Amino acid sequence: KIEEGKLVIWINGDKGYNGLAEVGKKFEKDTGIKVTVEHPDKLEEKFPQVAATGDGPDIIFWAHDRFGGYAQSGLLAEITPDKAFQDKLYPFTWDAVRYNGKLIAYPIAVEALSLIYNKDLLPNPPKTWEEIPALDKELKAKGKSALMFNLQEPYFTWPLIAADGGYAFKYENGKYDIKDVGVDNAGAKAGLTFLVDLIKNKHMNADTDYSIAEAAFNKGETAMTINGPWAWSNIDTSKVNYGVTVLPTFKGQPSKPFVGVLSAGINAASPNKELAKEFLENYLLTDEGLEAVNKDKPLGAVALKSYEEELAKDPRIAATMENAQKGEIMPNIPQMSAFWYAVRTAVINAASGRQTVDEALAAAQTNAAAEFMSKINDINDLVNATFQVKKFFRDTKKKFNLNYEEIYILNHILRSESNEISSKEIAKCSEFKPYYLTKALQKLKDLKLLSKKRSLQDERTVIVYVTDTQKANIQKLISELEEYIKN
């Protein structure tokens, strides 16, 4: 029940929701339809839950990295702006909101973690991470602290782990090899071990967090923090003489902050799509609209060309956009949430002292690439799960005589970047039986949708190939038999 006739927006708490609300009112003024902004807590996780139910906001705002998995689940409506309109925005921002050839959300503003310091407490910010353990005892001297940033969310500690070779999922020919996870490499271990030690040497504690670090900096207690545009508002009225700049380099390399494109996705459930499209296209993505929000909180380097040729003047923005370039754009693929988790754990677990970086990261690597996030804790959850499963198949037995192994495959395929997979992949993943695996690939082959599958080269591992129109029919079928459980 999304309730027609109005817009409900979900935007994160550290952002211009009051500003966006202004946009929403100008809309109501002209349109006549009301818009109400809300900043649920943890809307990124809450969205897929309530949105799977067919409820939730009409529009959800968040970094483009979550939208891949949303669109995947079917939570997001496909946006179809004409070419003229797309021209008002930077080609690379649409790219971030493009998933499997479709545009899933509107890009709003580019975000990158900048380095912010207190010029009255250090008119000269260090340009490296190694020349800091020292700068801490010098400022720890006059009763202060060198650095203080959020150590709870891996979005902040990633730049350091990334800098020297840490990476999400290897990238190459336009695709991401979700199997190739770079978080347990030398470069990754390096930056983390450093962060770990910065703590061991009482320079900063494992429990620092956004709230803590933000005050600590705005109240002069710390010489510098690590944050983005949205945080400038507070520092502004906290009227401190601060500067935004390049993230210190590690082992010589710059910090590679994952970059996020704050985008607005329209709920697939929503019954107000034409309205949301009109709000975002005609109202929000206009100079007024964007500045309206920028006033409340900094959007950073907006995606809207026109207005960005104003924000660009600002050295803060140019600083953001500089850090941006040095970092990589966040993948929008579904396996991202799994990535963020693996990392969150690893960091917290090793900064605390429960694990040695090696451990934290070896587990982290495994977790980041695991195909499944196990949702079963109690045997009651087991029973719960078993009941659900058992029910599912029995209901689809007649029509769709698709057994588990089969369903598993079609799914593994649909959630795949590649149009060609090997019996090895599908075998390593899923404790399957060579007997059923093969019988299953066959079972689907015999069906005009599994597309060709054919003897490996090396042999003993048949390659599974799926067309483009093939992968289109596997989708239409899943969406079809997915009605038997989606409720």
Binding site for its own copies (CB under 8 A): 1, 3, 41-42, 52-53, 72-74, 349, 354, 372-392, 394, 404, 407-408, 411, 415, 430-431, 478, 481-482, 485-487
CA dist 454 → 123, 402, 417 (Å): 66, 21, 19
Cβ 109 to ligand GLC, closest distance in Å? 9
Q: Which of the listed partners (ligand GLC, its own copies, none) does 388 bind, with a CB threshold of 5 to 8 Å by partner kind?
A: its own copies
Q: State which of positions 399-458 bind ligand GLC (CB under 6 A).
A: none
Q: Is 371 in the site for ligand GLC (CB under 6 A)?
A: no
Q: Is 155 in the site for ligand GLC (CB under 6 A)?
A: yes
Question: Residue from 11, 63, 268, 299 that binds ligand GLC (CB under 6 A)?
Answer: 63
The burial class, CB within 10 Å (0-12 / 13-18 / 19+), for 421 is buried
Q: Which two tokens stand for residue 445?
A: 């082959």
The contact mask relative to ligand GLC for 224-253 (x = CB under 6 A, - = no) is ------x-----------------------
Q: Is 278 in the site for ligand GLC (CB under 6 A)?
A: no
- CA dist 231 and 467 (Å) reads 47
Q: Is 79 in the site for ligand GLC (CB under 6 A)?
A: no
* N-terminal to C-terminal alpha carbon distance within the chain: 14
Q: Which of the listed partners (ligand GLC, its own copies, none) does 127 bind, with a CB threshold of 5 to 8 Å by partner kind?
A: none
Cβ distance to its own copies smaller for residue 202 or 486: 486
Q: Which residues pair with 176 in a beta bridge?
A: 171
Q: State which of positions 105-144 bind ligand GLC (CB under 6 A).
A: 111
Q: Residue 349: how many CA atoms within 13 Å on its side-chain side?
A: 16
Cβ 354 to ligand GLC, closest distance in Å? 19
Cβ distance to its own copies smaller for residue 132 or 429: 429
Q: Report CA Rg, the chain.
A: 24
Question: Residue from 69, 260, 265, 289 that binds ligand GLC (CB under 6 A)?
Answer: 260
Cβ 318 to ligand GLC, closest distance in Å? 19
Phi-psi region of 122 (alpha: psi -120 to 50; beta: other; left: phi over 0): left
Q: Is 340 in the site for ligand GLC (CB under 6 A)?
A: yes
Question: Residue from 16, 68, 69, 154 that binds ligand GLC (CB under 6 A)?
Answer: 154
Q: What are phi and psi of 180, to 5 degrees?
A: -85, 95
Q: Which of the listed partners (its own copies, ligand GLC, none) does 92 bind, with a CB threshold of 5 to 8 Å by partner kind?
A: none
Among the listed residues 62, 351, 95, the one whose alpha carbon sits nearest the alpha carbon of residue 202: 351
User: Can you say how many angstroms the Cα of residue 200 is from the centroid of all Cα atoms in its chain?
Assistant: 30
Phi-psi region of 275 (alpha: psi -120 to 50; beta: other; left: phi over 0): alpha
Cβ distance to its own copies smaller for residue 313 or 397: 397
Cβ distance to its own copies smaller for residue 3 or 131: 3
- CA dist 358 and 366 (Å) reads 12
Cβ distance to ligand GLC smaller for residue 66 or 453: 66
Contacts of 83 (CB under 8 A, 6+ apart): none
Cβ 263 to ligand GLC, closest distance in Å? 10
Residue pointed to by tokens 């923090």:
225
User: Can you say how many angstroms the Cα of residue 443 is from the centroid of all Cα atoms in its chain?
Assistant: 36
